[PDB]
Amino acid sequence: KVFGRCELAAAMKRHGLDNYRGYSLGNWVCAAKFESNFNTQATNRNTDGSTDYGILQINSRWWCNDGRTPGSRNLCNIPCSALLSSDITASVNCAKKIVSDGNGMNAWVAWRNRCKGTDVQAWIRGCRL
């Protein structure tokens, strides 16, 4: 599914992401924009052989099982394919665990490079929330 901007903001807020570990909703929308362009089916291979899955590009090196990442853990206890569902529940839950891991949203390199320090409220402007 490719979410609309406000549509995704609403879903993330219903799933408890808004202000989770102190990160306003705009931070999460912005991350998703640059990770996946709001597409739950996005996948991308990393240099190390792991793969990133879903709207928040969660990686198989640590967080999900894809059967093909030798280093690996599955700390979210989830097949990576669950992260590609129309229903964002598994991506949200696993993102809550990642953002709690010590480095906050820095775990998403794209968030650090493209969202951190910017006016992330713009990403939820105009949305009924």
From Swiss-Prot:
Describe the reaction catalysed, as an equation: Hydrolysis of (1->4)-beta-linkages between N-acetylmuramic acid and N-acetyl-D-glucosamine residues in a peptidoglycan and between N-acetyl-D-glucosamine residues in chitodextrins
Could you give a GO molecular-function term held by this entry? identical protein binding
Q: Where does substrate bind?
A: 101
Give the subcellular location: Secreted
Query: What's a GO cellular component annotated to this UniProt protein?
Result: extracellular space
Q: What is its main location?
A: secreted
Q: What is its EC number?
A: 3.2.1.17
Enumerate the CDD domains for this protein.
Answer: LYZ_C
Domain (C-type lysozyme): give its ranges: 1-129
- Which terms under GO biological process does the entry name? cell wall macromolecule catabolic process; defense response to bacterium; defense response to Gram-negative bacterium; defense response to Gram-positive bacterium; killing of cells of another organism
Top-level EC class:
hydrolase
Name the cystine pairs: 6-127, 30-115, 64-80, 76-94
Classification via Pfam families: Lys
Where, by tissue, is this protein expressed?
Answer: In the egg white and polymorphonuclear leukocytes.
Record family assignment: Belongs to the glycosyl hydrolase 22 family.
| Role noted for this protein | Lysozymes have primarily a bacteriolytic function; those in tissues and body fluids are associated with the monocyte-macrophage system and enhance the activity of immunoagents. Has bacteriolytic activity against M.luteus.
Name of the protein this chain belongs to: Lysozyme C
From which source organism is this entry? Gallus gallus (Chicken)
> What's the gene?
LYZ
